[PDB]
Amino acid sequence: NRPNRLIVDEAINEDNSVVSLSQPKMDELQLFRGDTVLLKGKKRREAVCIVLSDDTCSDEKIRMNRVVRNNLRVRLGDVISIQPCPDVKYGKRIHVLPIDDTVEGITGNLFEVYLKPYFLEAYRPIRKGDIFLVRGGMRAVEFKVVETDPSPYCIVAPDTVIHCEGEPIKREDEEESLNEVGYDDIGGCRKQLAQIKEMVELPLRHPALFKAIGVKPPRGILLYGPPGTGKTLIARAVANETGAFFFLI
């Protein structure tokens, strides 16, 4: 029922900095053309950037650059909460450095060979965590967050200073994406999983709600059984899916 709760679907503009529109929806929003719209999804990672390079497709499904699925999302069928937040500050500039596929070949400055021809009159309305493709060549290389002089995201400008002293890395970021075990990874304990869910849903998903009442919560759980029955896996999946901070003692 939430108006800005709408699916996201295929995208065709290979540049991630573009975010779609839906004129019937734009009338609902105040979506203005400029730097940024805050399109909010899962895990707090967003794809914030210039807007309105769409309305080619049908409505009820926002076109968002597929590269903002691995980030900000997982798969199709998801939903975006698009709400404008244009006119960001203009700090120094946003980091410039590649991550994986640039050490393979001539490196030079890692900015003025392949990436420079893209921060042109669209000076990176971004949000740290927006990952995309940008090159001056084979057209498949990532652009990741490394540094942060301004905490909030900004719109870069020339005359600034950048240091590509940083080195491209491994997929620490790709491994980070591959984590957070879930209930789909639990089998053979469906009744036990449901019991754990009904035990830990109220204390974790509703902390203030339970703080309002004066009932005693279940604060001790004894998962006992043969070794290798997924006890730590069950605990990790429950903590990750419910959002509770998991400490592996």
Ligand X SMILES: Nc1ncnc2c1ncn2[C@@H]1O[C@H](COP(=O)(O)OP(=O)(O)OP(=O)(O)O)[C@@H](O)[C@H]1O
Look at residues 53, 138, 126, 139 and name the one whose alpha carbon lies nearest to residue 96: 126
Residue 189 binds to ligand ADP (criterion: CB under 6 A): yes
Closest contact distance (angstroms) between CB of 137 and a copy of itself is 8
Contact positions vs a copy of itself (CB under 8 A)? 1-2, 105-106, 138-140, 195, 198, 201-202, 206, 208-209, 211-218
CA distances from 112 to 96, 138, 175, 214 (A): 10, 16, 29, 62
Concatenate the DSSP letters of all residues of 147-210 into one string: --SSSS-----TT----TTS----THHHHHHS----GGG--S-HHHHHHHHHHHIIIII-HHHH
Measure the CA–CA gap between 151 and 135, rounded to whole angstroms.
Answer: 26
Pick one of 83, 109, 195, 232: the residue that binds ligand ADP (CB under 6 A).
Answer: 232
Between 165 and 184, whose beta carbon lies closer to ligand ADP? 184
- Residue 145, interface with ligand ADP (CB under 6 A)? no
Nearest-5° Cα angle at 229, 228 to 232: 80
Q: How far is the CB of 109 from ligand ADP (least distance, A)?
A: 32
Please report whether residue 229 would count as binding ligand ADP according to CB under 6 A.
yes
Classified as helix, coil or strand, 238 is: helix
CB of 244 to a copy of itself, least distance (A): 17
Which residues form the interface with ligand X (CB under 6 A)?
185-189, 227-233
- Tell me the binding residues: 227-233
Task: Using the rule CB under 6 A, give the single segment among 27-35, 51-59, 94-102, 181-189 that binds ligand ADP.
Answer: 181-189
Which residue blocks in the chain are alpha helix, DSSP H?
23-28, 67-70, 172-177, 190-200, 207-212, 231-242
Name the binder of 120 from ligand X, a copy of itself, ligand ADP, none, CB < 5-8 A by kind: none
* Residue 186 contacts ligand ADP per CB under 6 A: yes
Region of 46-54, 73-81, 132-140, 228-236 interacting with ligand ADP (CB under 6 A)? 228-236
- Provide CB contacts within 8 A for 198, sequence distance 6+: none
Using CB under 6 A as the binding rule, whether residue 230 contacts ligand ADP is answered as yes
**58 is written with which tokens?**
């049908």
CA 72 centroid distance within chain:
3
Stretch that binds ligand ADP, among 59-67, 69-77, 81-89, 187-195 (CB under 6 A): 187-195
- If one asks whether residue 231 binds ligand ADP (CB under 6 A), the answer comes out as yes
Contacts to ligand ADP by CB under 6 A: 185-189, 227-233
